[PDB]
Amino acid sequence: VNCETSCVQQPPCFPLKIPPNDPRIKNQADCIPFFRSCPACPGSNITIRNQINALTSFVDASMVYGSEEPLARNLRNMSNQLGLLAVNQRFQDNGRALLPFDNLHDDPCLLTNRSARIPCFLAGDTRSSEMPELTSMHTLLLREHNRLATELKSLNPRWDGERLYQEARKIVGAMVQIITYRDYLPLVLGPTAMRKYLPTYRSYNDSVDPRIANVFTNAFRYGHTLIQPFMFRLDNRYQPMEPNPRVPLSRVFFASWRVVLEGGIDPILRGLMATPAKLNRQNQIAVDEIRERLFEQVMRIGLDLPALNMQRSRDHGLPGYNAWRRFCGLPQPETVGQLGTVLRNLKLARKLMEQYGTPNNIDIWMGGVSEPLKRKGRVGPLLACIIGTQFRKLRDGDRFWWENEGVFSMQQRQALAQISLPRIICDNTGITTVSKNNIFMSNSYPRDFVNCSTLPALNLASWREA
Amino acid sequence: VNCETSCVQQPPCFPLKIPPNDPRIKNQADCIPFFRSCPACPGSNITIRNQINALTSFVDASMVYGSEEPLARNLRNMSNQLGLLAVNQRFQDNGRALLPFDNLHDDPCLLTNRSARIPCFLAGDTRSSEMPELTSMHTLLLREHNRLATELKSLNPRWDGERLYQEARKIVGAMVQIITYRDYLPLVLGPTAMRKYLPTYRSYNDSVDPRIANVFTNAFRYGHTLIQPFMFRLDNRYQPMEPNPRVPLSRVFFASWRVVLEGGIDPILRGLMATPAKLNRQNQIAVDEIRERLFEQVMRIGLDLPALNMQRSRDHGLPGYNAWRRFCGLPQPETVGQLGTVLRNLKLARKLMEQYGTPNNIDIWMGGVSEPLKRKGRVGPLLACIIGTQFRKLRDGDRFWWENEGVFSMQQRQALAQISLPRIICDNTGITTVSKNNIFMSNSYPRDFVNCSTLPALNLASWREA
Amino acid sequence: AGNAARDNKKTRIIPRHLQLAVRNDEELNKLLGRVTIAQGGVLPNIQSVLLP
Amino acid sequence: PHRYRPGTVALREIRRYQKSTELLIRKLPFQRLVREIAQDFKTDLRFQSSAVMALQEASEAYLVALFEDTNLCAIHAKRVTIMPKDIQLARRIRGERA
Amino acid sequence: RDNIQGITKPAIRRLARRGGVKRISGLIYEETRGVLKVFLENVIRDAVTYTEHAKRKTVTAMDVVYALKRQGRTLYGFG
Amino acid sequence: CPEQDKYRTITGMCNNRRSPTLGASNRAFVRWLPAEYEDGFSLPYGWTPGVKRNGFPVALARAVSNEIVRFPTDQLTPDQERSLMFMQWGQLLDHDLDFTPEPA
Amino acid sequence: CPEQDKYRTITGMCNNRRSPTLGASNRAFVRWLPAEYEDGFSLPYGWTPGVKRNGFPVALARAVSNEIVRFPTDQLTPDQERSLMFMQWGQLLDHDLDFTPEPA
Ligand SMILES: *[C@@H]1O[C@H](CO[C@@H]2O[C@@H](C)[C@@H](O)[C@@H](O)[C@@H]2O)[C@@H](O[C@@H]2O[C@H](CO)[C@@H](O[C@@H]3O[C@H](CO[C@H]4O[C@H](CO)[C@@H](O)[C@H](O)[C@@H]4O)[C@@H](O)[C@H](O[C@H]4O[C@H](CO)[C@@H](O)[C@H](O)[C@@H]4O)[C@@H]3O)[C@H](O)[C@H]2NC(C)=O)[C@H](O)[C@H]1NC(C)=O
Ligand SMILES: *[C@@H]1O[C@H](CO[C@@H]2O[C@@H](C)[C@@H](O)[C@@H](O)[C@@H]2O)[C@@H](O[C@@H]2O[C@H](CO)[C@@H](O[C@@H]3O[C@H](CO[C@H]4O[C@H](CO)[C@@H](O)[C@H](O)[C@@H]4O)[C@@H](O)[C@H](O[C@H]4O[C@H](CO)[C@@H](O)[C@H](O)[C@@H]4O)[C@@H]3O)[C@H](O)[C@H]2NC(C)=O)[C@H](O)[C@H]1NC(C)=O
Ligand code: HEM
Ligand code: HEM
Ligand SMILES: *[C@@H]1O[C@H](CO)[C@@H](O)[C@H](O)[C@H]1NC(C)=O
Ligand SMILES: *[C@@H]1O[C@H](CO)[C@@H](O)[C@H](O)[C@H]1NC(C)=O
Ligand SMILES: *[C@@H]1O[C@H](CO)[C@@H](O)[C@H](O)[C@H]1NC(C)=O
Ligand SMILES: *[C@@H]1O[C@H](CO)[C@@H](O)[C@H](O)[C@H]1NC(C)=O
Ligand SMILES: [Ca+2]
Ligand SMILES: [Ca+2]
Ligand SMILES: [Cl-]
Ligand SMILES: [Cl-]
């Protein structure tokens, strides 16, 4: 009953069936491998099936420190008392830290390069080894934590390893929260949805449920519409970096050897900073790299990311488009004319009506990404509603929110208010020219790029204990 | 470990610990037997513990027909094709039907008075065996269903057993809904609460959840404060019936032999109709009969109903009083004075403060029944909010609601709007004088009692199939 | 205002929709507190004590 | 002879007039009152129609807000009947007659 | 010239109904007429002052708008 | 389940056509508020002695009933505007709505 | 849960002192709407062939992606107000928040 090799629909396999005249798969007997999500408690005929969340729902940088005690202990440097995290013992990025290698029985990392023999990376999340941009983020956060711990050890020699680790982790989590709720969410939701669903912080509700909604795991996948079909690497002058300046995405999945042996994470960060994203249009939703050739090297056949999204929404038993429009307080179309009016694209309404037959059956992801984008935003009203509600609950329902009283001192809060992802990139890498404020908006060199020295630094003097 | 005889805190036993200087239990090593409710899916360390509802949440008279296929099949009169319900084959109430006898390995009804050897009655619920008034209700509903089936067969000779049974069940369920939502609930919630939480019926939400809330099972126990300590029987002249006109409640638990051998259900219904209920007061909450001698004859030791309610609320993991006050949008007291103003009782607030320590820890039942009663109601604002929300969800989320379009014809609804409980009582029993309109409010004889030849009968002419 | 007009099944924005938009938003109501909008009406609100 | 309760039609009117945007005062009497009042400041005065309309809108909004405050005052005194003392108290607290 | 009576009792009742008033006393109408007269006197006096300053014999909507704005009663919809 | 029906299913299945389970028998309760257990998920408050709820010790249910609920029976007052029919119909409706099973 | 703590726990427990399991790891999701399965509780839509959803046949996911999602790559529209940093931080935040395990 192995799902990756057999197309028989036996649990837990839920393979995707190939429609006739498929452009890529010419044999209907074949299928897309698919695994059903683990039930909350298996074998129960009384409870409605529910899925498990394996990570802490809070924005606490659990992708760097982990969400389980054994993994968190294994991610630390126990050979000393400076409270550092474990780094790579074999490779370095121009004298800087690298993520430690991870040992799994079935490692997809060595399949992309059978000559490099570079295994997957070890981090707080098992998905950190997709794709060199995410690995660059994880390495940057690791380096930032190590630098923060070093500076704290310099300021307070009396503190022990556990205290240094906890304080550095606290600062990193506060930094992640600040960057997320100050730079990212306003660009995602837009000012209208940001003000409607995420008002001014007041205090800590203990009555707000901080759990992650089941629909959120499929509504936050709107980012699959922002994926460019290439990976870009730039040199110190922000010019294309030879060789391989533009690499197809199908050749970078689970390829850690590109991070290791191809110049480190500096070109990847430069490409992320100085390259425009892909706009979500109703006739241009997702590129063919993730739609036809996803995980092509490490699998027997390429996957279909939007198809996987909708099959997962069906697997999770999520309600349809109309149910979620009703949930968010939005009008629910019933005919093709009403759907066209709602979507502002009549031809797309005809296509959706032909495929599904009724708006109630439209999958949550498809309806969310087919809606026109909000002004100064990148999600539709339904997706904006869902995301804003989830993040408002994650913010108000968190006891260790950085703005909550007792977590950080007033001087510490003011010092943390001066942080920026550009400053972190300046500090933890060899990049000297960095985009200006709102790093998620600046994408053209050198119009919105400044020197790294003009960025204010984080003043840790408020953390000195006496 | 048997929770009935042992006093150890091993699963599934959660016995009640005896405080020092108990007025009845002088042994501190003794305990009150208690069974933890069955979990929704057992043995799981992932899911939070949840309980099981063994009945249909809808108001469909499932106490008469059952919520399971085999029980419903066993409850029918399958010896013919008249679509009737099974009746007792050994005893009759002056020529009228009785509930069929049940067959249990352990029968609590037999322990009450062994010479008669009368087992528990079999009906749509397992708890009909407690109380001669409840048994009288079940017998009355069974007789009403049989009479409806006979009348429908007389009107439509071509109908088979299944159609007759289904139509009679439909009419009985509609009658139950009408009586519940027209006569009972206004006298519970009061005028303002009924208007706020149960507005006029409009249409059928299929998006309203009709599930019974976990807190509702403990909040609806407010009727334990309306229990009189005795059982009364009046004859046809509404005078006390010798012998035993006023019998202690501790001698009627599971005493079906009283129903069988002491005049049937007519005196019981007369006693229900012609006596006043107990008034819930902040210093007169619950009587001693259900407080010290509950199930005294059958169990090894008399239980205590309010403590059972508190222990069940703790077992189900229900939040405290302040959490439910916040849930209903009501002010949440935090000190003794604020609780005193909330309860309009400083002494009761002081006693609650001494017992619990904080209003956040007050059990839902205790706090709810400690609140002052609403105007023309019998519950406080919190209990009124919970009950109104639950019943609004039940009414709006029911597809087969009697007022819903397509369930009944206009003539059928016009006929059904005329039904009343006193009419059912007269049609199905030998009582020729019954209370006036709003039987739940009339409790004085002969002021509020009329000859029931003056009450209009239900007209089934609209049910005839042309 | 456009959201309010859509909630009323209307294609155009009239002053009633502007008043509904302003008075239903706490911050906009605070900003336009001493401002009267012509042909805007008032927010539907009946005191609880006056209900039957 | 179907007669409603002494409070049903009042609530119906409250719901009807809180959902509309029309003007509750007849235009011609209000115009005549405005001209009569303006006669005390300058004789031989001409009025634009928009001026009278603006005056009517402002007066209606002011009266509606004053009546809301008066209803709050009456409810404070454990009453449902609107009385002149409620209007006087509202005007004082607002700062008009204070 | 008795035009304050042109604001009839049903008109005051309608204005109170828009304000959420359920029951009205019989003496409220005279008080409302007086309040309306005072408010109109103030606003019209300010508007007429604005008109005289402009050397005009016609009261425009802008004069009324400015008069209302001077009293902290800004009106939107007339300029 | 059938697209067209005329009567209720005895179990309650497919009363809500979108989610047939909703309202059926032998199904878990719905939670209006998250559960508050001693250990977080399964243990009730008062299971292990010495564990306090919200910083305060857990009171015995029997003690609370003895202190607050108890009152002399002879001082009972009747409800002039209600009858025992009221509470009997309340109990019948409760038995209509819900029933939480317990192990044998 | 300790009465006083200065830092978060790795597993996320004891963040909410009333319900300590709220937001912790290895816990079931919260459902904002009741689930909609083929049989009601476990079977996803499209599992058994011939079963319609709300009176209409269930469309294949690959077919929907082929008909609607598919578009020629050469007509890609760059985003002049966003960078790839936006998408990368979105994915990093998603990996911070949620992860649904599957059998090996
Ligand atoms: C059929 O009933 C539907 C459900 O009815 C519910 O149950 C009945 C018995 C009533 O009690 C009813 O009031 C209940 O809603 C009903 O659809 C419902 O419509 C409402 C109003 O549009 C929806 O509420 C909106 O929901 C979202 C999200 O907020 C909710 O969810 C989050 C997460 O759970 C919570 O944190 C929130 O507190 C809410 O619970 C929002 O879009 C919205 O709030 C925002 O928007 C409004 C105006 O747009 C502002 O006033 C607010 O301040 C916010 O800015 C609402 O709260 C509700 O979700 C929806 N229910 C369901 C199940 O889909 C439907 O209208 C009825 N049908 C007919 C024909 O009448
Ligand atoms: C701390 O937050 C608490 C929870 O906050 C929620 O989550 C955050 C993230 C925000 O989205 C916030 O808006 C959310 O509410 C919050 O306590 C909350 O308070 C509200 C308002 O008092 C409560 O809603 C009330 O609930 C009941 C029941 O109705 C609800 O439940 C049923 C069953 O699910 C549904 O069918 C309904 O549609 C509702 O969802 C009612 O008593 C009440 O409605 C009636 O009463 C009000 C007057 O009070 C009238 O205006 C209405 O028209 C109705 O007549 C409310 O809907 C909510 O339950 C409660 N949540 C919790 C979890 O306890 C708290 O205020 C915040 N504290 C501070 C200090 O800010
Ligand atoms: C190199 C980049 C990416 C890869 C390899 C990738 C791939 C995948 C795959 C195969 C899944 C499982 C099936 C599914 O899609 O539901 C998944 C889930 C998910 N994706 Fe992506 N995607 C990428 C980009 C993104 C982006 C940009 C976002 C958000 C901005 C995102 C958000 C999510 C989320 C929240 C999940 C749910 C996690 C889970 O269900 O396990 N992904 N991703
Ligand atoms: C002669 C009358 C009554 C008897 C014998 C009785 C007895 C009981 C018992 C033994 C329980 C279970 C105890 C527990 O689980 O903690 C219970 C629970 C309950 N009672 Fe009563 N009670 C009576 C009156 C009432 C009334 C008048 C009402 C409502 C108006 C009511 C509503 C409930 C409800 C809803 C439950 C929940 C069921 C459960 O907990 O399993 N009861 N009753
Ligand atoms: C731990 O830190 C030391 C420096 O303090 C470094 O040399 C060593 O490599 C680190 N060990 C690991 C396993 O990362
Ligand atoms: C695999 O990695 C090696 C370096 O070890 C490199 O020379 C080679 O080109 C890589 N192969 C591919 C197909 O990229
Ligand atoms: C079925 O009904 C008939 C006729 O009323 C009756 O004689 C018979 O006893 C019933 N059967 C059962 C098993 O109750
Ligand atoms: C037990 O039942 C018999 C009739 O068989 C009756 O005479 C007797 O009084 C009953 N016992 C009690 C204690 O009521
Ligand atoms: Ca996290
Ligand atoms: Ca039922
Ligand atoms: Cl609950
Ligand atoms: Cl969900």
Q: Exposure of G70 by Cβ count < 10 A (0-12 exposed, 13-18 middle, 19+ buried)?
A: middle
* CB proximity under 8 Å: A 150-179 to G: 166, 169-170, 173, 176, 179
Q: How far apart are CA E69 and CA E48, in angstroms?
A: 14
Q: Is the CB of A110 under 6 A from ligand 6?
A: no
The amino acid at residue B143 is R
The SS3 of residue B369 is helix
Q: Residues A59, A176: contact at Cβ < 8 Å?
A: yes
Token pair 């025992």 is found at F84
Chain C / chain D CB contacts < 8 angstroms: 39
3-class DSSP state for residue B407?
coil
Nearest residue of B to residue G27 by CA position?
Answer: B46
Query: Which tokens sit at B332?
Result: 């949440």
**From G53, which residue of chain F is nearest by alpha-carbon distance?**
F18
CA A124, CA A100: separation in Å to the nearest integer? 11
Instruction: For residue F82, give the 3-state DSSP assignment.
Output: strand
Distance G12 CA to ligand 8 centre (A): 63
Q: Using the mean position of ligand 3's atoms as its centre, give its distance from the Cα of residue B373 in Å.
A: 55
**Cβ–Cβ < 8 Å for F65, B356:** no
Residue G16 and residue A358: Cβ atoms within 8 Å?
A: no
E69 torsion bin: left (phi>0), alpha (psi -120 to 50), beta (else): alpha
Q: Running DSSP on this structure, what letter comes out for residue G41?
A: S
Question: What is the rounded CA–CA span in Å between residue A196 and residue A191?
Answer: 8
Indicate the pairing of strand E23-24 with strand D81-82. Answer: parallel
Burial B226-256 (b: 16+ CB within 10 A, else e): bbbbbbbbbeeebeebeeebebebbbbbbbb
In our burial notation (b when 16+ CB lie closer than 10 A, e otherwise), range A393-424 reads bbbbbbbbbbbeeebbeeebbebbeebbbbbb
Is B63:B128 a contact under the CB 8 Å cutoff?
A: yes
> Which phi and psi (to 5°) does residue B257 adopt?
-60, -30
Question: In this complex, is the C-beta atom of C46 within 8 Å of any C-beta atom belonging to chain B?
Answer: no
Task: Please tell me the distance from the alpha carbon of residue B355 to that of residue A159, in angstroms, as a whole number.
Answer: 45
Chain F environment of G35 (Cβ under 8 Å):
19
The three-class DSSP label of residue D16 is: helix
How many other C-beta atoms can be found within 10 angstroms of the C-beta atom of residue B175?
23
B48, B209, B319: residue with CB nearest G21: B48
Distance CA F90, CA F84 (A): 10
Strands B433-435 and B449-451: antiparallel
Q: Quick one: which H or E segment has residue B218?
A: helix B214-219
> Tokens for B410?
């206009």
Interface contact B63, partner F, CB < 8 A: yes
Helix ranges, F31-83 (H)? 61-64
Angle at the Cα of B11 from the Cα atoms of B8 and B16, rounded to 5 degrees: 45
- Residue G66 DSSP class: I
SS3 B366: helix
Pick from B115, B252, B262 the residue to mutate for probing ligand 8's pocket: most ligand atoms within 8 Å of its CB: B115
**Residues of G taking part in catalysis:** 95
Checking D52-56 for CB contacts under 8 A at 24+ apart, the result is D52/D27, D53/C38, D53/E61, D53/E78, D54/C38, D54/E61, D54/E64, D54/E65, D54/E68, D54/E75, D54/E77, D54/E78, D55/D30, D55/E40, D55/E43, D55/E44, D55/E64, D56/D23, D56/D25, D56/D27, D56/D30
- Max alpha carbon distance in chain C (Å)? 37
Q: Which atom of ligand 3 is nearest to the CA of A226?
A: 27
Resolution (A): 3.1
Q: Do G47 and A14 touch (CB under 8 A)?
A: yes
**How close, in Å, is residue C40 to chain D by CA atoms?**
6
Q: Whose CA is nearest to atom 3 of ligand 6?
A: A116
State the total domains in chain D. Answer: 1
Contact predicate C1/C28, CB 8 Å: no
Cα(A287)–Cα(B102) distance, integer angstroms:
68
CB G95 within 8 A of CB A128: yes
Residues E21 and A426: their CA atoms lie apart, in Å, by 65
The length of chain D, given as a count of residues:
98
Contacts of range B203-207, beta carbons closer than 8 Å, 24 or more positions apart: B203/B404, B203/B405, B204/B396, B204/B398, B204/B399, B204/B401, B204/B404, B204/B405, B205/B396, B205/B397, B206/B397, B206/B399, B206/F16, B206/F17, B206/F18, B207/A323, B207/A326, B207/F18
Residues in chain A: 466
How many interchain CB pairs under 8 A, A with B?
23
State the nearest Cα–Cα gap between B382 and chain F, in angstroms: 14
Q: Which two tokens stand for residue D79?
A: 């009453």
Q: Which residues of B450-465 are buried (b: 16+ CB within 10 A; e: fewer)?
A: bebeebeebebeebee
Nearest-CA distance A271 → chain G (Å)? 8
Q: Domain-by-domain residue ranges, chain F?
A: 1-104
DSSP D5: -
Calculate how far, in angstroms, residue A32's C-alpha sits from the geometric centre of ligand 1.
38
How big is the CA angle at A370 (ends A346 and A17), to the nearest 5 degrees?
Answer: 105
Is B64 in contact with B176 (CB distance < 8 Å)?
no
Provide CB contacts within 8 A for A290, sequence distance 6+.
Answer: A224, A227, A249, A305, A306
Alpha helices in chain D (DSSP H): 8-17, 27-38, 49-76, 84-94
Contact G55 F3 (CB under 8 A): yes
Q: How far apart are the first and last CA of chain B?
A: 63
Q: Whose CA is nearest to atom 41 of ligand 2?
A: B328
DSSP 8-state symbol, F29: P
Three-state secondary structure of chain A: CCCCCCCCCCCCECCEECCCCCCCCCCCCCEECCECCCECCCCCCCCCCCEEECCCCCCCCHHHHCCCHHHHHHCECCCCCCCCECCCCCCCECCECCCCECCCCCCCHHHHCCCCCCCCECCCCCCCCCCHHHHHHHHHHHHHHHHHHHHHHHHCCCCCHHHHHHHHHHHHHHHHHHHHHHHHHHHHHCHHHHHHHCCCCCCCCCCCCCCCECCHHHHHHHHHHCCCCEEECECCCCCECCCCCEEEHHHCCCCCHHHHHCCCCHHHHHHHHCCEEECCECCECCCHHHHHCECCCCCCCCECHHHHHHHHHHHCCCCCHHHHHHHCCCCCCCCHHHHHHHHCCHHHHHHHHHHHCCHHHCCHHHHHHHCCCCCCCCCCHHHHHHHHHHHHHHHHCCCCCCCCCCCCCHHHHHHHCCCCHHHHHHHHCCCCEEECCCCCCCCCCCCCEEEHHHCCCCCHHHHCCC
Provide φ and ψ at E11, rounded to 5°: -65, -45
Q: B116 CB under 6 A from ligand 8?
A: yes
Number of neighbouring beta carbons within 10 Å of residue B415 = 18
Cα F33 to averaged position of ligand 10 atoms, centre (Å): 23
Q: Domain ranges in chain E?
A: 3-79
Angstrom CA distances, F30 to A48, A215, B213, F9, G34, stand at: 11, 18, 5, 21, 10
CB burial of D7-22 (b: ≥16 within 10 Å; e: otherwise) equals eeebbebbeebbeeee
Which of D36, D39, D85 to mutate against chain E (most E CBs within 10 Å)? Answer: D36
Cβ(E59)–Cβ(E51) below 8 Å: yes
Q: How far is B320 from chain A (nearest CA, A)?
A: 12
CA-based end-to-end distance of chain F: 34
User: Is residue E18 within 8 Å of E35, Cβ to Cβ?
Assistant: no
Query: Is B91 one of the annotated binding-site residues?
Result: no
Are F65 and B306 in contact by the 8 Å Cβ rule? The answer is: yes
**For residue D55, what are its two tokens?**
């005056």
Distance, CA of B245 to CA of D47 (rounded, Å): 89
| Partners of B231 in the β-ladder | B247
Q: What are phi and psi of B432, to 5 degrees?
A: -105, 0
Cα of A107 to ligand 8 centre, how many Å? 80
Pair of tokens at residue E72: 């902290």
Q: To the nearest 5 percent, what fractions of chain E are helix, strand and coil? A: 60, 10, 30
Fold of E3-79: Histone, subunit A (1.10.20)
Q: How many CB atoms lie under 10 A from the CB of residue A227?
A: 20
Contact between residue B14 and residue F47 where contact means Cβ atoms under 8 Å apart: yes
Distance in Å, CA A341 to ligand 8 centroid: 78
Suggest the residue from D33, D73, D75 to mutate for an interface test with chain E (most E CBs closer than 10 A).
D33
Cα–Cα distance between D47 and B339 in angstroms, integer?
63
- Ligand 4 binding pocket includes F90 (Cβ within 6 Å): yes
Shortest-distance Cα residue to atom 18 of ligand 3 = A221
Q: Are G59 and A246 in contact (CB under 8 A)?
A: no
A1-466: CATH topology: Myeloperoxidase, subunit C (1.10.640)
3-state secondary structure of B434: strand
DSSP symbols for E51-62: HHHTT-SEE-HH
Atom 4 of ligand 3, residue of closest alpha carbon: A130
Pocket residues for ligand 5 (CB within 6 Å)? A 77, 79-80, 82, 84, 86-87
Burial tier of B9 (Cβ tally within 10 Å: 0-12, 13-18, 19+): middle
Residue with tokens 């006569």: B183
Tell how far the Cα of B380 is from the centroid of ligand 2, in angstroms. 18
Place of tokens 């005193």: B340
Is A32:A307 a contact under the CB 8 Å cutoff?
Answer: yes
Helix orientation angle between G84-97 and A161-179, rounded to the nearest 10 degrees: 130
Instruction: Label the pairing between strands A276-278 and A246-248.
Output: unpaired
- Under 8 Å CB-to-CB from E56, ≥6 apart: which residues? none
Q: Is B99 exposed, middle or buried (0-12, 13-18, 19+ CB in 10 A)?
A: buried
> What is the Cα D14 distance to its own chain's centre?
14
Question: Where does chain B break, by residue before each gap (C–N > 2.5 Å)?
Answer: none
Ligand 2, atom 37, residue with closest C-alpha: B389
DSSP state of F75: G
> Which ligand has an atom closest to residue A66 CA?
9
For residue A431, count other CB atoms closer than 10 A to its CB: 20
Residue with tokens 């709050």: D72
Provide the chain A residues 292-321 that lie in CB contact (below 8 A) with chain F: 319
Name residue A422's amino acid.
P
* Residues of chain G with C-beta less than 8 angstroms from the C-beta of F19: 34-36, 40
How far does CA G82 lie from the centroid of its chain? 24
Among the partner residues B50, B327, B397, nearest to F29 by beta-carbon distance: B50
Among E21, E68, E74, pick the best mutation site for testing chain C contact (most C Cβ within 10 A): E74
Ligand 2 pocket, CB under 6 A: A 205, 207-208, 392-393, 396; B 196, 326-329, 385, 389; F 32
Neighbours of ion ligand 10 (CB under 5 A): B 56, 58, 60, 62; F 96
> Chain-centre distance of CA B257, in angstroms?
21
F45 reaches B (C-beta below 8 A): yes
Pairing of strands F52-53, B31-32: unpaired
Query: What is the widest separation between alpha-carbon atoms in chain D?
Result: 55
Q: Please count the helices (runs of H) and the strands (runs of E) in chain E.
A: 3, 3
